[PDB]
Design a protein around this ligand. Sequence first.
Ligand SMILES: *[C@@H]1O[C@H](CO)[C@@H](O)[C@H](O)[C@H]1NC(C)=O
Ligand SMILES: [Cu+2]
Length: 228
Amino acid sequence: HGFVSGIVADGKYYGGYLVNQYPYMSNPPDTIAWSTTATDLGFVDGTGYQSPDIICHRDAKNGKLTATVAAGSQIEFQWTTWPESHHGPLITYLAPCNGDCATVDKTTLKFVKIAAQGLIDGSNPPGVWADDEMIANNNTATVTIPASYAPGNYVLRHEIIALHSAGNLNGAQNYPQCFNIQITGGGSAQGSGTAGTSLYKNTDPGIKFDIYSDLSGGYPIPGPALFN
Ligand SMILES: *[C@@H]1O[C@H](CO)[C@@H](O)[C@H](O)[C@H]1NC(C)=O
Ligand SMILES: [Cu+2]
């Protein structure tokens, strides 16, 4: 259970969608982060993989602001304190808004996987994962925006998949957080995206996954192919 409280882009801090505060007000602050109704700091599980909730978490609604970021530079995502039990991958995507992200219909977004980290050391189940490294780094995850990416308006979708209960069907817990960004500089490249409601199936091997048994077979990070 947790959420992204803010991000750093081009070295500038942007406050996120404070889901434990902003829903409890008529007129919360503007943010680059999408609003959600996930006030229990909870998740979308496999029962919702085909729901609009998987896109940006949820009942999510477009953030009002947009952060500029140079292609080829780093974004830091500051999570709230992440529980050790919730081992799993960190996956980050870009979807073009093809227009203004403040008004794009989220149901139309097609996400390209730009970063993904999974099982780091599975010598001893339940293993050490991407989220374990995030915990150790002041509950912060980092990605690089590809240097060759086309300049434009994008939804940045950053997600933890907790796998502590993932041996159960629909037991994997997805924690997507979305932000509006404007990539500057860059090149001409873009991936071919996947609708949010097409990212995952509850039968995918990295979704219906047992962290507690021998990990000699590794961990197949779910979702579409990683962009190069
Ligand atoms: C740790 O993260 C918090 C937000 O969770 C941030 O406010 C603080 O500045 C960070 N500490 C360091 C040393 O960067
Ligand atoms: Cu939890």
